[PDB]
Amino acid sequence: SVSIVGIASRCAPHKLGADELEAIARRHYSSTPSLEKMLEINRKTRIDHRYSVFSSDHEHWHRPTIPSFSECDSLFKEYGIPLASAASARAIQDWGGVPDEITHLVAVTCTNTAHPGFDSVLCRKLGLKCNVRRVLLHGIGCGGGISAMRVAHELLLGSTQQGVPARALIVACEVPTVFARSELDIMDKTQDVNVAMCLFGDCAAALVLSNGIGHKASEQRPIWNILNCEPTQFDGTEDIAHFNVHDKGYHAIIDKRIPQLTGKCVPAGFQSLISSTPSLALEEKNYVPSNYGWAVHPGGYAVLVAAQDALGLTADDLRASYDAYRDGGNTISTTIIRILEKLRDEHKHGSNQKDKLVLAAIGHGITLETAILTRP
Amino acid sequence: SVSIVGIASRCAPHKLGADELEAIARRHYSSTPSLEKMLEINRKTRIDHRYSVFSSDHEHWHRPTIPSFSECDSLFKEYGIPLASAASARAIQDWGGVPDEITHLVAVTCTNTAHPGFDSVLCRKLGLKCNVRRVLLHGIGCGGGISAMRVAHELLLGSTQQGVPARALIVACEVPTVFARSELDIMDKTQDVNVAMCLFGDCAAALVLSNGIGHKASEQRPIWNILNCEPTQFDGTEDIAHFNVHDKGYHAIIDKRIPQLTGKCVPAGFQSLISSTPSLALEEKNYVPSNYGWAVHPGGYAVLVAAQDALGLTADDLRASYDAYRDGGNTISTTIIRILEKLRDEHKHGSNQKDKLVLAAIGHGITLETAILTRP
Numbered sequence: 001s002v003s004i005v006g007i008a009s010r011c012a013p014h015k016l017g018a019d020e021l022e023a024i025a026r027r028h029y030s031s032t033p034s035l036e037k038m039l040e041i042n043r044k045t046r047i048d049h050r051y052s053v054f055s056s057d058h059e060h061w062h063r064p065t066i067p068s069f070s071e072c073d074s075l076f077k078e079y080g081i082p083l084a085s086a087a088s089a090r091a092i093q094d095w096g097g098v099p100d101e102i103t104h105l106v107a108v109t110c111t112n113t114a115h116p117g118f119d120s121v122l123c124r125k126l127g128l129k130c131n132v133r134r135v136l137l138h139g140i141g142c143g144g145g146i147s148a149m150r151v152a153h154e155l156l157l158g159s160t161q162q163g164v165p166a167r168a169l170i171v172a173c174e175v176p177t178v179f180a181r182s183e184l185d186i187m188d189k190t191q192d193v194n195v196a197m198c199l200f201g202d203c204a205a206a207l208v209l210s211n212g213i214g215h216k217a218s219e220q221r222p223i224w225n226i227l228n229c230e231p232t233q234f235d236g237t238e239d240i241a242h243f244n245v246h247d248k249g250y251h252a253i254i255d256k257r258i259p260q261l262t263g264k265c266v267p268a269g270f271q272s273l274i275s276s277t278p279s280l281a282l283e284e285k286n287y288v289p290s291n292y293g294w295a296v297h298p299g300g301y302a303v304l305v306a307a308q309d310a311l312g313l314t315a316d317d318l319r320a321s322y323d324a325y326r327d328g329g330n331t332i333s334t335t336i337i338r339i340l341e342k343l344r345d346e347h348k349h350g351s352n353q354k355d356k357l358v359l360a361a362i363g364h365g366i367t368l369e370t371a372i373l374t375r376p
Numbered sequence: 377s378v379s380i381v382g383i384a385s386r387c388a389p390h391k392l393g394a395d396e397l398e399a400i401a402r403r404h405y406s407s408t409p410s411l412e413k414m415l416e417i418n419r420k421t422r423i424d425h426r427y428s429v430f431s432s433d434h435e436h437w438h439r440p441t442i443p444s445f446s447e448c449d450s451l452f453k454e455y456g457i458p459l460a461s462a463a464s465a466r467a468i469q470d471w472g473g474v475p476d477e478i479t480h481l482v483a484v485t486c487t488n489t490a491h492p493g494f495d496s497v498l499c500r501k502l503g504l505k506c507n508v509r510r511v512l513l514h515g516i517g518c519g520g521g522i523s524a525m526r527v528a529h530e531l532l533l534g535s536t537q538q539g540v541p542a543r544a545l546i547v548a549c550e551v552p553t554v555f556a557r558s559e560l561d562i563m564d565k566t567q568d569v570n571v572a573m574c575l576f577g578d579c580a581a582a583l584v585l586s587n588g589i590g591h592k593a594s595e596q597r598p599i600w601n602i603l604n605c606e607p608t609q610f611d612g613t614e615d616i617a618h619f620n621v622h623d624k625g626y627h628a629i630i631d632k633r634i635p636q637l638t639g640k641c642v643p644a645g646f647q648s649l650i651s652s653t654p655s656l657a658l659e660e661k662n663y664v665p666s667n668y669g670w671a672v673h674p675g676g677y678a679v680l681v682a683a684q685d686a687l688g689l690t691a692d693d694l695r696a697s698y699d700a701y702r703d704g705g706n707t708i709s710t711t712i713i714r715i716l717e718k719l720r721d722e723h724k725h726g727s728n729q730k731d732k733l734v735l736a737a738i739g740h741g742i743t744l745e746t747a748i749l750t751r752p
């Protein structure tokens with residue numbers, strides 16, 4: 001089996017509560033209908049705390065000009081990469097192995113574009129071996145954590161086929177608040193309310209996966225085994241979510257139809273996942289969502305609610321997903337790892353969890369990424 | 377074994393010769409020393425033909441303003457994606473299988489950033505199945521073709537581990553001429569000569585790979601088997617090559633030290649590759665470059681020469697690499713596939729080639745990507 005053997009996450013350090021966002025908005029823009037509507041919505045997201053790499057007194061929030069794309073890149077390098085290094089180091093510490101033994105690095109972000117990519121820098125910071133096998137995923141957004149898991153899972157199975165040890169570091173790093181000034185400016189000029197301003201926060205998170213070959217005493221035993229992962233792209237959904245490039249960074253388009261789409265896509269993806277899993281596809285009970293633990297990427301509050309109802313679950317089933325959302329908001333590709341961390345921590349402290357766990361996240365496409373994890 | 381079973385490429389249709397580039401440059405810029413130096417270098421690259429998606433009368437070459445990043449994205453969608461669709465379709469045609477049986481898609485570009493990424497569009501254009509397993513690689517540049525091969529190779533071994541059929545479509549798509557207007561403008565303003573203006577052309581290319589499981593009569597037999605792929609990142613080389621984001625796209629920095637670095641990195645990477653290949657690592661003869669066929673990404677004319685001399689090879693050994701460079705220039709992640717295509721075509725027409733073939737490409741990092749292919 002391929003197993004998860006290390007987990008860690010690191011939210012940015014500075015709170016970006018509703019009062020903080022309002023202060024930023026009103027500092028730079030006079031009252032307009034879109035500004036007032038955004039601020040009203042901002043207080044109703046049911047997010048208690050979001051985090052930014054930028055403190056309230058940082059020039060990012062006070063400067064009169066919108067950051068150039070080059071500045072946005074430099075800010076990601078300055079603030080995002082250290083967050084990623086820390087999360088990665090901590091996941092390697094959780095694993096217990098040595099950086100030298102990492103054979104694969106699978107990285108993901110949708111808040112930076114660079115050549116070389118941030119994964120290259122991370123190899124140096126962490127002291128990974130010169131022949132570590134890197135993949136930097138692009139284009140997927142909120143689907144990215146599970147996507148990285150899917151990719152790493154199969155790469156590790158490939159090493160199992162060769163009979164050699166493999167250990168993958170998965171690293172997700174997102175600094176969406178870098179683009180907050182640009183988004184505010186676009187909202188003011190167009191008067192199109194952009195709820196991205198209300199939902200997103202900064203975070204990095206990491207996993208270590210193992211193919212179980214060449215296990216050493218220093219290594220943590222499997223936390224979960226990864227049984228199967230399956231993506232689905234849905235026709236007729238292209239316009240639903242976009243993160244489009246422009247002169248001052250990326251601009252988010254978040255269609256109001258996402259929660260309703262979620263309610264239809266998630267159960268369809270679940271059925272498809274189970275159907276594609278030979279060890280489970282034949283028994284009828286395996287097609288009942290309540291027979292599994294669940295972790296759902298919280299694209300927004302209404303996304304959790306839509307998934308919850310459509311799958312026949314309770315809010316308590318998704319407690320860890322609501323908790324992650326409430327304390328950190330939507331941190332894009334990192335959120336699913338934050339939720340896994342919460343679930344792991346609860347189990348350590350005595351919680352009763354089911355033996356199978358389903359991960360699900362809606363990403364650009366529209367794509368649904370899923371995975372099934374099992375208790376060892 | 378994992379095998380290559382389909383190959384195709386498609387350069388853009390419009391020639392961008394020395395006269396054409398000079399016409400474009402002088403149309404928008406009065407003479408300066410850096411302009412004259414660039415144009416002088418341009419006629420010495422030993423590239424006979426480069427191609428652009430933009431014809432001589434296209435507004436891209438006549439507009440008085442520099443394209444915004446949003447326009448650059450739209451242009452890639454308008455011109456790049458069709459190029460990728462055509463190359464992909466042709467590779468699938470070469471393979472002979474059904475688009476529905478493609479299990480994995482591994483895509484790469486360094487001339488577009490989008491959410492969803494261009495791979496998502498390609499799935500729809502080609503009619504790939506809803507659960508096709510996509511990866512869009514980022515951050516690697518000229519290393520990208522071999523990088524995609526490395527990733528696809530391991531993913532397919534992962535399916536072999538599971539005992540199921542796997543067929544990967546690899547697609548590389550590069551439209552660097554989209555950024556030519558921005559690059560010209562930066563060169564005028566800074567007076568920093570940018571040889572990127574002289575080297576790069578537009579192209580898409582594709583491979584189909586198979587893990588050999590569930591082989592159908594309709595499918596082409598292995599062209600090459602992929603034995604092993606090995607990347608190396610070299611410390612102390614970070615600033616040697618960068619493709620950095622800014623308001624109007626990406627800007628290339630091409631250090632004069634690249635050919636010198638190539639001459640050191642390639643033999644080192646070759647030795648590492650063989651050392652890491654169990655079926656070859658023991659015999660002394662296997663560490664001699666002349667005992668293999670070679671395909672080297674032509675970063676520029678001087679890069680080919682540096683690799684040739686350092687490996688003890690002749691220009692004739694690298695004939696297909698020089699040929700690809702001469703007719704198409706540096707097409708970034710697609711060039712290595714163009715060379716494989718040339719080598720396939722020559723062999724089909726009766727040429728004598730060696731049993732083993734090494735692919736090598738210098739990419740951002742600085743990274744060297746390598747692969748060893750064998751005749752079935």
Ligand SMILES: CC(C)(COP(=O)(O)OP(=O)(O)OC[C@H]1O[C@@H](n2cnc3c(N)ncnc32)[C@H](O)[C@@H]1OP(=O)(O)O)[C@@H](O)C(=O)NCCC(=O)NCCS
Nearest residue numbers: 041044045193195241254255256258259299300301302303
């Ligand atoms: C934003 C959100 C937290 C608001 O929660 P709520 O107040 O319970 O939701 P409501 O249905 O009451 O919406 C309240 C207001 O928000 C607006 N709103 C909701 N989603 C919106 C979107 N995507 N864009 C613009 N406005 C939106 C509604 O139009 C409504 O405006 P009104 O008061 O003028 O009628 C909730 O709608 C949500 O979680 N949406 C999903 C966000 C999403 O798609 N996330 C994925 C990002 S990739």
Ligand SMILES: CC(C)(COP(=O)(O)OP(=O)(O)OC[C@H]1O[C@@H](n2cnc3c(N)ncnc32)[C@H](O)[C@@H]1OP(=O)(O)O)[C@@H](O)C(=O)NCCC(=O)NCCS
Nearest residue numbers: 417420421569571617630631632634635675676677678679
């Ligand atoms: C550009 C190139 C084709 C020129 O070929 P050449 O004329 O045989 O090479 P030379 O050494 O005679 O160089 C001629 C001029 O080009 C200039 N030049 C070469 N490489 C350069 C670079 N990367 N940046 C700026 N100028 C460069 C030299 O300084 C020299 O200028 P000078 O005539 O004022 O002295 C060749 O240098 C080359 O292939 N370089 C490598 C390109 C590269 O790094 N590719 C990777 C892109 S990722």
